[PDB]
Every structure is written in C-alpha cells, then in structure tokens.
C-alpha cells in the first residue's frame, strides 16, 4: 500500500553536502521505521543508516562521522545527507520502509532478546555519482 | 549465555509468609504492624540465599 | 563480493547462508536483480509477506543447530538474480552489512540463436560515423564481434558492452565502430560477425 518514489541530483561535487530526498505516497511518516542502503558497483549493498518513528536516528560506524537522516512532518519525505563525499560514495541509493520486530529466548525481566529490523517495502532507486 | 535464577509460585508464597505472620503475631500482638525486608549487610554468604 | 551457485531448471536448490549465527536468530533473505528494486523473500525465518509463492521457504530454528538455507521449489529463469542473507543473533551486536551475494545460476536454458542487425552510419553531416551492430535474444551471454572491411578486420576504434540480459531473459549486446565518413565510403562494404557458440552470422552493409 506504500509506493517510495526517490530524488536526488545525480552528481556532486567531492567535498561536499550530498542531499538525496524519498517522497513517500502510501501512509503517514510517523509510525513505521526507515532507512537508507547504498548498492556501490562491484561491491555488496552497504546499509548506512536509519531512522526511527520517535525521530532518533542511527548511523553505520564506518560513516557515522559523515551522515545525518532527517525526517518532514508536513511533507511526506525523508532527506539523507552526507557530508564530505569522496569517489567512494557513488552507488545506487534505495529508501527502504522498515519493521521493529524483538527476538526473544529468554526470561523477559533478565533481558535476554534483541530488536531485529526487516525492510519490506523498497524504492525504485536513485542513482548518485560523485 | 543467559542467567542462573530461581522461581518460586507467588501465591504460596504469599499464604506461607501469612501464616508466618499470624503466629509471629503471638509474641507481639495483634495490632503491632511488622513487615519484611531484604538483608542489611556482611558478608556475601549473609545477605544471599 | 559475490558467490556463485548452479542449479538445474525445475529442481529444488538449497541456497546456504555464510557467517552464520552464534545465538538465537531472526534471519531475512532479501534477493536482488542487478539494478532494480530489492525484494525480500524472507522477514522472519518462517513468515513471507503476502504476495510471495510457497515455492520459497527458510529453515526456522526449531532446536538450536540448524542453519539458514533458502530452499526454492521448481527454480525458474526468473529466479536468476543475487540473494543476500541479512543476519541477526543475540550474541552478534548489531549486524550492519548484509550476507554475502548469492549468485543464482539457472542451468539447461534453451539457447536462442542471437537476432543481429546492423546500421550504417546515420551524423556524416557531423563529420563522424559510427555503424552500430546491435545483438538482441541471445542464450548464453556470451558472444564475440569480429568487424570487417571487405575482407580485411578493423580491429580500431571498436567499442563494445558486455551482453546484459533483458526482459525476455535472453541477452542483449551493442558494438559501435567509430569512423571518418571518408573511410566509411572508401572500402565497399563492412561485415560485423557474430560468434554465438559454434554458430557465426554475418551482417554486410555499404554505402549507397
Ligand atoms: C522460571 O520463571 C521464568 C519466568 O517466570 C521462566 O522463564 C521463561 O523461560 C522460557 C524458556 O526458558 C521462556 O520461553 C521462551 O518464550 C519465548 C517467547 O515466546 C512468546 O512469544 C512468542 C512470539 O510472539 C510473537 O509472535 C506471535 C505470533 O507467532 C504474536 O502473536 C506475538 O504478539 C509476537 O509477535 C508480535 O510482537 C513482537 C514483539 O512486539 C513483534 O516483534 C512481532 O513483529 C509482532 O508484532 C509466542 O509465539 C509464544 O507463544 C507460545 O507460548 C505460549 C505460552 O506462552 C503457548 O500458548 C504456545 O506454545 C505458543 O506457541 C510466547 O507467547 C520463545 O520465543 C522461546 O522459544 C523460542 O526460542 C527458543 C530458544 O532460542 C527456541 O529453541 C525455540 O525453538 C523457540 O523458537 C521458536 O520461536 C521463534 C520465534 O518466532 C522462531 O523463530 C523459531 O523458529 C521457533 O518457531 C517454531 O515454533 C513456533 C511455535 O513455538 C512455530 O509457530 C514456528 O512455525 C516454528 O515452528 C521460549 O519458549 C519464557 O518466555 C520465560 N518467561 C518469561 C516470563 O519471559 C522459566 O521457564 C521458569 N522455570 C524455570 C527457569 O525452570
Ligand atoms: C518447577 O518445576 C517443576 C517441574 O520441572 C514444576 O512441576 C510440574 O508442574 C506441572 C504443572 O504444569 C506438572 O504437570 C508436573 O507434573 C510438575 N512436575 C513435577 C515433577 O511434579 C513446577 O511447577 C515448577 N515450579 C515453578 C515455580 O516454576
Ligand atoms: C489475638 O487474636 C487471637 C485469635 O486467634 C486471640 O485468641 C487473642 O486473644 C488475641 N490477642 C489480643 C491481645 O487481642
């Protein structure tokens, strides 16, 4: 029922704040996760970063110190950006929709359970060159 | 790699520490409120089960 | 990177999950056609969203040993595409990076003799020419294009893209030999050959 529609410029210069947009169509912001994975070519697809329905946002170590993830009240849309761009950050962008789904084997009190995350519902796909 | 824990039924529990009562109350009287808590210190092997 | 795996046309392949896991597991299988739109298969070790057939299931972790395998029933053409394994477990932190890239291979598909067609240059009132042979509905991705003047081979300014697969699951392929329009009129006519396995074809065009 959700359909993810992604924008971004294409091209950016090295050194600079890459800003890519996913427009989204089926339902509100604010109750289901996102996040965003990157397909470099000739590489696995990397996932950088996500951010929550409660506006928390949490970043992949390697780029961590780079990325920031934003999200639109009015709008329908979540912006990444990425700052200081070098030649490895060219690939495919994909916004994807994403579940909070808690493993457990335990005792509930002790803790012993862990959040594991899904992402069902996919975007077509933006490319990004630098 | 979880916990090593113990269980014990709540509602037995609760009839024994009842009936613990109603004879402590024996030596102290009726009225007298008493209540029970955790350990107040020493070594390990005191404060513990 | 990326690892291969064959499977025969029709018969169940079982696609086994690397870095496996050290605790209790919630494991996704995601599959992935070069440059679309991922897809995955799998959220929880059981459950599919709706929509995605029965012929593709995961091993759910019942007794603690058992490992993730994508079992495929009755594998098809269209299955050909890449499969990550997104990994999750108690005793694992926080898993960034996907599985490793499964390279699914359908075997024993009928091969199609490959439907060539050449076009000269169009752009000579541009001072260039480019013939343009163009491979459509080819099996196996693999083909050779040998350029001919007359009789004797170009072997310059050739430029050719390896063979990418297209809607009909067959291949695809385009070879551009850029030359001065005066050359293009100077030798009689020019021949772009295609070697498809054992078989050749060969396309003649000349300037008018
Ligand atoms: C001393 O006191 C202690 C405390 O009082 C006490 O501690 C207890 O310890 C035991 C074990 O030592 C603990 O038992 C464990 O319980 C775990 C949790 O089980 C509960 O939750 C699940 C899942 O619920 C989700 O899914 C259902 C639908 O399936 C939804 O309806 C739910 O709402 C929920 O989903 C939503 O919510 C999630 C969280 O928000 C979201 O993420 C999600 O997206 C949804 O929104 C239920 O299924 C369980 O129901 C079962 O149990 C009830 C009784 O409670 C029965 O009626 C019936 O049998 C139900 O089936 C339950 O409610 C278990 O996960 C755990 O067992 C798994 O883990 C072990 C260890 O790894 C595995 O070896 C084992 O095989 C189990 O794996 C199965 O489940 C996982 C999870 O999906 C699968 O991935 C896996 O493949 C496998 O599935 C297979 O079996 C399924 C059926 O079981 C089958 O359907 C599948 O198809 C597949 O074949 C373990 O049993 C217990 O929690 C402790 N107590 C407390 C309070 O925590 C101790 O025992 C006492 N005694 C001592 C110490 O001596
Ligand atoms: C402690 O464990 C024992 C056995 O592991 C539990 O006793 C069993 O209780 C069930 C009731 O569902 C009976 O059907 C079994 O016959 C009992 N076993 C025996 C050996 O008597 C007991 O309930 C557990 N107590 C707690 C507090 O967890
Ligand atoms: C306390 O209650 C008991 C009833 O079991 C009664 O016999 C006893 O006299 C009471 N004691 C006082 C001080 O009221």
């Known amino acids: 029922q959700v359909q993810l529609q992604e924008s971004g410029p294409g091209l950016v210069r090295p050194s600079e704040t890459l800003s890519v947009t996913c427009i989204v169509s089926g339902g509100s912001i604010s109750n289901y996760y996102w996040t965003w994975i990157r397909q470099s070519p000739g590489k696995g697809l990397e996932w950088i970063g996500y951010?929550?329905?409660?506006?928390?946002?949490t970043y992949n170590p390697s780029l961590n110190s780079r990325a920031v993830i934003s999200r639109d009240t009015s709008k329908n849309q979540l912006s990444l950006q990425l700052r200081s761009v070098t030649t490895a950050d060219t690939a495919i962008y994909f916004c994807?929709?994403?579940?909070?789904?808690?493993?457990?084997?335990?005792?509930?009190?002790?803790?012993?359970?862990?959040?594991?995350?899904?992402?069902?519902?996919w975007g077509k796909g933006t490319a990004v060159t630098v | 790699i979880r916990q090593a824990h113990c269980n014990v039924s709540k509602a037995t529990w609760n009839e024994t520490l009842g009936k613990v009562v109603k004879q402590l109350r024996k030596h102290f009287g009726n009225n007298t409120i008493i209540r029970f808590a955790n350990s107040s210190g020493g070594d390990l092997e005191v404060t513990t089960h | 990177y990326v690892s291969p795996l064959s499977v025969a046309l029709g018969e169940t392949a079982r696609i086994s999950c690397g870095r496996q896991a050290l605790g209790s597991r919630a494991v996704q299988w995601y599959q992935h056609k070069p440059g679309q739109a991922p897809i995955l298969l799998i959220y929880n070790n059981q459950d599919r969203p709706s929509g995605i057939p029965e012929r593709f299931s995961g091993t759910p972790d019942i007794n603690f040993g058992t490992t993730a395998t994508l079992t495929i029933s009755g594998v098809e053409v269209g299955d050909e595409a890449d499969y990550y394994c997104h990994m999750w477990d108690s005793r694992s932190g926080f898993s960034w990076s996907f599985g490793g890239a499964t390279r699914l291979t359908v075997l024993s598909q009928p091969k199609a003799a490959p439907s060539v067609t050449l076009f000269p240059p169009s752009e000579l009132q541009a001072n260039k020419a480019t013939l343009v042979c163009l491979i459509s509905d080819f099996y196996p991705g693999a083909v050779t294009v040998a350029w001919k003047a007359d009789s004797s081979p170009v072997k310059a300014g050739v430029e050719t893209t390896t063979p990418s697969k297209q809607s009909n699951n067959k291949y695809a392929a385009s070879s551009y030999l850029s030359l001065t329009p005066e050359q293009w009129k100077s030798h009689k006519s020019y021949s772009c050959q295609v070697t498809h396995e054992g078989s050749t074809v060969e396309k003649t065009v000349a300037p008018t």
């Open positions: 994807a929709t994403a579940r909070r789904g808690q493993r457990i084997y335990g005792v509930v009190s002790f803790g012993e359970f862990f959040y594991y995350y899904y992402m069902d519902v």
């Open positions: 951010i929550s329905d409660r506006e928390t946002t």
